[PDB]
């Protein structure tokens, strides 16, 4: 539905990523998106502007334009935003919070002081929506209609994986797929360094490592097999791969990724307990 009007409160990386993805998917026209920022001097705002997205310094204007309204500002700004534009949330609005940690309860508490049944959806998505390969989960609020969940899923499915979850899973999702791309970019940078150390040109090492990661991830998604089984299938006895896997194990490679997911999840919980 290109007839949908979409707003973003916040014109940062995620607003840009989602707007880019939605327009590339054909589901929205760029000029049917409006975004607001208190800082119009950002680079993301210039890219949004170049895309044809409407830009304004007035959050109220984004709200009035919008049918689906994404909250795409830092968690600690969300209560101030709700104070500011709570009076302007209408019954027709679906309010979609993308802020890490921020609970449906806290949003509904603010918005309920104005109209009684604000339709609220909480989502955790990630920057690969920009190439329509995002990972998105969402939870529906108290007054979100069944059609609202399905509309949400349809829209976010256009830019990658999307599924409904209970809200108590979202902080963990944040630690896994929300922060996940950054772990991968770190990994890809390091793998390229290892390629370069062993004699590959940087450009080729970056390409090969990224292609290797894309292909393996795709294999797993399209396989009913355990990742341990796919790992077994790669490594011939006495061979190069199993030697590399040993040195990963000796440094506690697996545990570092578990540490990461946990640290991001826990911090996400602190961002909310800091608020409440």
Ligand X SMILES: O=C(O)C1CCCC1
DSSP assigned state of 8: E
Over the window 175 to 204, marking each residue x when it contacts ligand X by CB under 6 A and - when it does not, the resulting string is: ---xx-------------------------
* Closer of 148 and 171 to ligand X (Cβ): 171
Per CB under 6 A, 234 contacts ligand X: yes
- Do 93 and 119 form a contact (C-beta atoms < 8 A)? yes
The entry of a second copy, ligand X, none near residue 262 (CB within 5 to 8 angstroms by kind) is a second copy
Question: Distances in Å between the alpha carbon of 185 and those of 2, 218, 231, 262?
Answer: 33, 17, 21, 18
Binding a second copy (rule: CB under 8 A), the pick from 101, 106, 120, 138 is: 101
Q: In the block, which residue shows the tokens 């969402």?
A: 138
* Order of strands, sheet of 119-124, starting from the edge strand that comes earlier in the sequence: 54-56, 33-36, 6-9, 68-71, 94-97, 119-124, 134-140, 160-164
* Closer of 52 and 239 to ligand X (Cβ): 239
Does the annotation flag 276 for ligand binding?
A: no
* In the complex, minimum distance from the CB of residue 59 to ligand X, in angstroms, rounded to a whole number: 20
* In the complex, minimum distance from the CB of residue 190 to ligand X, in angstroms, rounded to a whole number: 18
- Do 104 and 149 form a contact (C-beta atoms < 8 A)? no
* Closer of 152 and 265 to ligand X (Cβ): 265
The tokens describing 54, both together, are 């409407």
* Closer of 116 and 238 to a second copy (Cβ): 238
* Binding site members for NADP(+): 9-14, 37, 59, 72-75, 98-100
């Amino acid at each position: 539905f290109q007839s949908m009007s979409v707003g973003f409160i916040g014109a940062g990386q995620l607003a840009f990523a989602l707007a880019k993805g939605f327009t590339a998917a054909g589901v929205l026209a760029a000029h049917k998106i409006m975004a607001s920022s208190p800082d119009m001097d950002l680079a993301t705002v210039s890219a949004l502007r170049k895309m044809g997205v409407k830009l304004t310094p007035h959050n109220k204007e984004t709200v009035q334009h919008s049918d689906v309204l994404f909250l795409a500002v830092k968690p600690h700004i969300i209560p101030f935003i709700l104070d500011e534009i709570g009076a302007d949330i209408e019954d027709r609005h679906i309010v979609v919070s993308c802020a890490a940690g921020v609970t449906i309860s806290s949003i509904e508490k603010k918005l309920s002081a104005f109209r009684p049944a604000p339709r609220v959806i909480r989502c955790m998505t990630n920057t690969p929506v920009v190439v329509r390969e995002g990972a998105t989960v969402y939870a529906t609020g108290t007054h979100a209609q069944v059609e609202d969940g399905r509309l949400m899923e349809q829209l976010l499915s256009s830019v990658g994986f999307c599924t409904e979850v209970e809200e108590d899973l979202i902080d963990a999702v944040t630690g896994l797929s929300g922060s996940g791309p950054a772990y991968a970019f770190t990994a890809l940078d390091a793998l390229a360094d290892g390629g370069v150390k062993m004699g590959l040109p940087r450009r080729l090492a970056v390409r090969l490592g990224a292609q290797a990661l894309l292909g393996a991830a795709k294999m797993l998604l399209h396989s009913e097999q355990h990742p341990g089984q796919l790992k077994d299938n790669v490594s011939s006895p006495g061979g190069a791969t199993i030697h590399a896997l040993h040195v990963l194990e000796s440094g506690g490679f697996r545990s570092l990724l578990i540490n990461a997911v946990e640290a991001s999840c826990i911090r996400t919980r602190e961002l909310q307990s800091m608020a409440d």
